[PDB]
Amino acid sequence: DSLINLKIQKENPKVVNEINIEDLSLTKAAYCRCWRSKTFPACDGSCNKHNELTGDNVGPLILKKK
Amino acid sequence: SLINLKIQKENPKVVNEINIEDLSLTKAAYCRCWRSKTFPACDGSCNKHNELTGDNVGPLILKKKE
Ligand code: FES
Ligand code: FES
DSSP states (O other), X not given: OOOSOSSTTTTSSSXXXXXXXXXXXXXXXXXXXXXXXXXXXXXXXXXXXXXXXXXXXXXXXXXXXX | OOSOSSTTTTSSSOOEEEEGGGOXXXXXXXXXXXXXXXXXXXXXXXXXXXXXXXXXXXXXXXXOOO
């Protein structure tokens, strides 16, 4: 095991994001689980770049309403 | 260097979809560290990860209420 998050909110000892499900604007939203997104906590597809470089297989949580 | 060490490594890209209507609790933590034994749920494995590796990752908390 080693660091997952390299640069996101490093002054925060534990980065936890709350989502109010009742207010989901979109029908489907992608949330980041690679800590590489430039729009974290949203997924911006940086996962794919990480996966290609490293051979990893990480991907987002997709939230669907309705 | 990998983020996900163990979860479904045969899967080209691990993406989980959550149907909002199936969440019954006022909060449900979802893992962003790839260490949970209940992945995609968070089981608090993030904490020991952070303690041992010097990281600061934590879950996405999906909150629901009447
Ligand atoms: S940018 Fe991180 S999961 Fe897609
Ligand atoms: S167990 Fe992974 S974020 Fe909590």
